[PDB]
Design a protein around this ligand. Structure first.
Ligand SMILES: [Mg+2]
Ligand SMILES: [Mg+2]
Lengths: 284, 284
């Protein structure tokens, strides 16, 4: 109602879009920090509003450390306030660009988190449909910070069967079944995970062509390779996992639950994560 | 029947030949654009008609982004209408002339597409027999536009063996086996690909003589070289690939499938094709 200005202190602007700005805020009585997406609702089109309602509704259900969580959704006179987790680490996209590419150890940890977020969504009947590095946010700048899934604006709710949910997504990450206009479901997100994993390891995507007819033909055929020298020193296990995700027939494609059990993901190299002294916590 | 004028709006003339004109057209109910080759069929000779039937039949089977595709073939009273992909980028011939020659990076991308079109034809039992820059069309003027194979007027359907299919093709691109009048097959097109690749890199052909007896002797012997200074700075990999294609014995000549796996073709220099932000598509 006026439940936002009464309850939160607004701080500095974090970002802006069409019809909205995101500002950091602090809840007054508890001191917890959040990011408030502040939307001018009198200037939203009927479709824009439909998309906001769907995204808030889907987002409110999803509570996992690797999802940017929605904590409150508040309608004031002319503005709507969506109070999300605060993330300060920037997009995974920007981090890949800055680092050029990830070691196998880092890529494995990164895609593990991405797959855990996707497994959690799928177990709750949500298919994201637009997974890409721009939609994955690092919780903070500290190494090991959670990678968190964002932007559920294209997400759909699914049951246990495939359906034609429409042509939507981002071209370099689109799955063959969406490009063929076949009914589809959860596996579309695993194909995008495969694209991301390939990008993590070498810093460029498996499917790239300035002619979109060629690009979509290549995706539909599952036509990609592992060029020298950059792939030369990458393990067969990493490539095999990518192949399992970039499997053209979605019925034969690995699921997120299955991928999380693959040795390359869960065979723990633990010299730098052996036992360590830990401080006591005492909140009594 | 009258299925063309009822279904398409004809626009401006794109080109003309003997017995035909090509005009851009727009399909009325979908709005898609095409190039219609409009042929006066009452003025075609029996052989001309045989060639039209063969070319339409072969062309209708071939669906690949790097082939100028035939979408419909419609007989009206006195005119036949072949509704093809619209290409606005002109012949590869004209683009080579305008640019003089291609960088190794550009030549590699260009011949990759040409080889992909040829590999697709060969896998479908079609040998083009007349591959040359005049028969390769750029889909549009934008850089990276698909290079598309055209003019299947001399194409043949082959099984897994060699046969004598006759003496036909274009002199500077003819293979040694056709000039020797040996049985031949798919490899003839790879020899022409080699001629084209040499032309792409330096802007002139490997075999040129105003005396045709000399020209054909030189081709049959595989007699060409890499003159200074223009070849001086071209990599050994580019030359080795050309040598593999310009291999006189067709049984030892590289195939299109094999050439597409050569590092010079698929070792991706990807600084300018690393990850990039991509827009969402939403057609819902
Ligand atoms: Mg985004
Ligand atoms: Mg021609």
């Amino acid at each position: 109602s006026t439940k936002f200005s009464d309850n939160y202190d607004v701080k500095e602007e974090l970002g802006k879009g069409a019809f909205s700005v995101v500002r950091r805020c602090v809840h007054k009585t508890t001191g917890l920090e959040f990011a408030a997406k502040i939307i001018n609702t009198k200037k939203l089109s009927a479709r824009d509003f439909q998309k906001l309602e769907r995204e808030a509704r889907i987002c409110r259900k999803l509570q996992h450390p690797n999802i940017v969580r929605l904590h409150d959704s508040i309608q004031e006179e002319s503005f709507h306030y969506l109070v999300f987790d605060l993330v300060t680490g920037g997009e995974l996209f920007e981090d890949i660009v800055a680092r050029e590419f990830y070691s196998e150890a880092d890529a494995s940890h990164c895609i593990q988190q991405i797959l855990e977020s996707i497994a959690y969504c799928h177990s709750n009947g949500i298919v994201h449909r637009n997974l890409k590095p721009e939609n994955l946010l690092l919780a903070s700048k500290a190494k090991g910070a959670a990678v968190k899934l964002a932007d559920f604006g294209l997400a759909i709710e699914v049951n246990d069967s495939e359906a034609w949910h429409g042509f939507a997504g981002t071209p370099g990450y689109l799955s063959p079944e969406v490009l063929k206009k076949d009914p589809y479901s959860k596996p579309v997100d695993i194909w995008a995970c495969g694209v991301i994993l390939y990008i993590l390891l070498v810093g460029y995507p498996p499917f790239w062509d300035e002619d979109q007819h060629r690009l979509y033909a290549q995706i539909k055929a599952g036509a990609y390779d592992y060029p020298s020298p950059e792939w030369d020193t990458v393990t067969p296990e990493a490539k095999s996992l990518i192949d399992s995700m970039l499997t053209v027939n979605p019925k034969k494609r690995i699921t997120a639950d299955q991928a999380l059990k693959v040795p390359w993901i869960c065979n723990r190299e633990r010299v730098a994560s052996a036992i360590h002294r830990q401080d006591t916590v005492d909140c009594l």
